[PDB]
């Protein structure tokens, strides 16, 4: 498929409901290899038996939180993928009181930092950790939201730590596209008032995903694609 | 391939070097069967011979400034094709008088006139006449660029055709979602301060465009994608 | 007030209710000299009796459809304005059959030609039959709306033409900010429960930020299509 | 002048060359009181005498990296001005070891995170400590830069910062707004060939845009970014 040959690097798989996990199911369809990272203990189990009906056996730990963390997992991925073709940043957190009623008055210092440093900084510090070992014309994704664009209630600052990523995401595109590397995201529907009548899936998500981390995409970085459905170009439908 | 089962009408093929040449030869790799418009006699030959080249042997005249030639195509077209999966719309013009220095001098009602009537209106009339042949799950595609959204030297009055068709690309997705059809265009660079160091190549527009008329693009409708190596998204490099 | 020592024309004043009536009213509070053009006969009684009450006795005929009455236009203006600082632009038009129901359906070529040619390139018209008489430090404005960034159901054509528009006040304002004049629209809202302001905007509050757009308090804002909806467009599932 | 009658806290005036002393004069100007905060006591001196020729004596110490400091001052302000009606946010710092160069190499976690915390979620800070003094009819103001929405040079974290700020006035927006408060950001220009004004933009420019935004005048706006940079934005190889 149009993935055959691309080695590539899927963080962010906890459950069957993961966005991540539709991604690597169209990826793998598509004929890419993939090695998966898991946060914790609590998932590696999870993350071990996806893998394995992937056909890979490349499950390494990485907490993005820790800078050891994320070295430790790319010099364990060099062991057995000493370059390989990018990877997909399905990875967010904001503290749970954050995203509980009016934005002024749930945003604290301690939450906007957390929210920023996992959701955003995150993508960059997995790309610095990785640069060698990326080949040219490599890829590297992260997913968005709306969120980042409009106010909507109770995302709060995760609408904030997500504008930070789409600004990451035209900033890594500009310094790494002259070493071959495009960096983009899908900004997802939540997964009536959408043009097209439904909800946006994971293999909706998956299907777009595939084809940004893919040479079909050659022509496309530094860009945000909304998978929505319309939703963000309507209004009062 | 990942088109194998679309039937795709094509317009604008008027030598190798068009976008639609591009996106038909990258169409047809993925197993779309084509179909192909011509404007008038001095294209004929050429766009056969390409169609020839290709497989098919659908070709057809539509000189898309004239309501009785589009509807006198599609009922040519509902012979072969009696329903079908969708199109792309390359075709685009402006008098050349237009193109030719300050913006303000060089625009004309009558110059305003054509450049909108061709470039966008073209877009939708083409979708009123086929409406009713469109299987559930066709998309559409245009083709615009970044004069639509930037003020871009001599682009002139083209750029507000551009910015009309784009805002038609959003009208159109909404008002046909809900029968199944997707609309979208591709905002390409033209065919240094580009993140990816190159200029964009028919190839790369035909790869974004096959996949945004295929099922793989499912989520994404109203969609302006910029198929322009990150350019736009840049300043000061 | 900011507006001293400014001579502006006001097209569009139609009513008390015009968005065109709010500007002229804030502009003329704001000590500019106004003058004013109305489309048609029909019109022309109550335009000169808004005028008069807004310190103007310049009221002239201008259909923006034919590039002669433009000329003839500013020609008379010339007779007393031989200079002035800029103009609002506040026509728009599409023929009623274009804003109902399913967009494909309504949509047709003459009703988007109309649109497009009355509500775009009209702005670009008048520019260019007063471009000589405009003084450095000048100001265009035009009035936009939504329906130009959003498919909104019935606005249909209307969307295109207003997306035409405000790129007509980028390439507008490049070619001629190097001259000295400034163009920019204001995208209004209708004229709200999900508002961030909790109320519709009036025109007032449009007439109060048309008022600073042609005045050398905006000399930084060029090209710009500054949202005057109450936050509206920024808001999402409110 | 047009904000008189409005009582407005100027953060971020270091110099004469501050974009907040721009702002400060144009406010001062047009009526408004004003108070003033420092960074820290080397700023002390300097920030007093600046204050005394806009005719304040409200002049108070604010690091925006301690909460305590921004509740500190807020009683402070509170014992002179119980109630008042905005604040202008102009605060933006990143370790000078994050602007040199390739973007991804300078960057560090250490890095991005001082650059968000002091230049975006310094402005909700300072929001959420002074609620409940704010005047219906209030309006609160950041300073935004090209870089949030372009990948610029050098500029590199502060672009990230920029545009968390720029969502960061979305957001306030839309939850204060039901109680009588806007919030805003202006775009600002450097402070040239291919600006379509020709020159680059001023204190003055920007001063007077902000002005406006803190006044009733920009009644209709709120959640919006204006960009206050000549046109450059909208422009491309001119
Ligand atoms: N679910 C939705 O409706 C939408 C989600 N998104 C984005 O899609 C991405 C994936 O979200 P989902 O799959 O829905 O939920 P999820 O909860 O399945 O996945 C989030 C993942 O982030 C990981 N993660 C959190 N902190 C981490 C850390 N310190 N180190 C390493 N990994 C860490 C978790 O282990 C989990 O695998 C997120 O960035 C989210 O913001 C975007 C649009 C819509
Ligand atoms: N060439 C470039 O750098 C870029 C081009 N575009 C757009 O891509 C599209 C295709 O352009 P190109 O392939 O470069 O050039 P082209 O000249 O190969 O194709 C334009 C086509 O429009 C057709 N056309 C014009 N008026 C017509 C009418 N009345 N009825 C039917 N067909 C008509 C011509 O026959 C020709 O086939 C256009 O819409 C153009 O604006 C977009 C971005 C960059
Ligand atoms: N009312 C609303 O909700 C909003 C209106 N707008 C825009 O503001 C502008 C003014 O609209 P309104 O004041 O609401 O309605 P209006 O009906 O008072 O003003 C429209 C004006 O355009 C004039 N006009 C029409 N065709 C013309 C022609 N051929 N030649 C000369 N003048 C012509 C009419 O005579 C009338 O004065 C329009 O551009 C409209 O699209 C923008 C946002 C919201
Ligand atoms: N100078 C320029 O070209 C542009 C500047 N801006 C923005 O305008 C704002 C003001 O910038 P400038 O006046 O140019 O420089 P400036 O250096 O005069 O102002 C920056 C101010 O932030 C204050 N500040 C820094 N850290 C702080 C902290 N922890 N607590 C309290 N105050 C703190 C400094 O004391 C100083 O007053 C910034 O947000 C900047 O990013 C926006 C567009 C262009
Ligand atoms: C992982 C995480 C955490 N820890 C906190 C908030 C959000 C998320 C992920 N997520 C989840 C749902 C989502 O839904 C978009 C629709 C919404 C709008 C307002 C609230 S949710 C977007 C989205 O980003
Ligand atoms: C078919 C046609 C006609 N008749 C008139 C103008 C433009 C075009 C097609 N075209 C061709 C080239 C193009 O280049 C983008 C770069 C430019 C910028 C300024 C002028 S050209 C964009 C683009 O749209
Ligand atoms: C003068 C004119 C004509 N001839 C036809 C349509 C619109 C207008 C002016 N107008 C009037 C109202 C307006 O309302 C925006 C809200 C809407 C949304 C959908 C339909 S109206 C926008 C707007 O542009
Ligand atoms: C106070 C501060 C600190 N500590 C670090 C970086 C920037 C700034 C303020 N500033 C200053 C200049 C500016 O210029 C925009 C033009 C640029 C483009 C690339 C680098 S500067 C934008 C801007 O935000």
Redesign the interface.
Known sequence: G?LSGKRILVTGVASKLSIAYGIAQAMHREGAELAFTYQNDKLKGRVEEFAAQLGSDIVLQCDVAE?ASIDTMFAELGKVWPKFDGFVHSIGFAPGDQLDG????A?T?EG??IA??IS??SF??M??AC?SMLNPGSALLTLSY?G??????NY??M??????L???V?????????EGV?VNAIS??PIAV????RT??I???G??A??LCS?????????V??????F??????
């Open positions: 149009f800078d009016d934005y002024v008055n945003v210092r906007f930092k920023h440093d955003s900084y960059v510090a790309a610095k640069r709306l980042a664009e409009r106010a909507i209630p709060n600052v609408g904030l730590a997500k504008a930070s789409e600004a990451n035209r900033y890594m595109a500009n310094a790494m596209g002259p495009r997802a529907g959408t043009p097209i009548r946006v899936t293999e909706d998500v299907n777009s595939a084809f040479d079909l995409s050659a022509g496309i970085s530094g860009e694609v909304h998978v929505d459905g319309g963000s170009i309507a209004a009062m439908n």
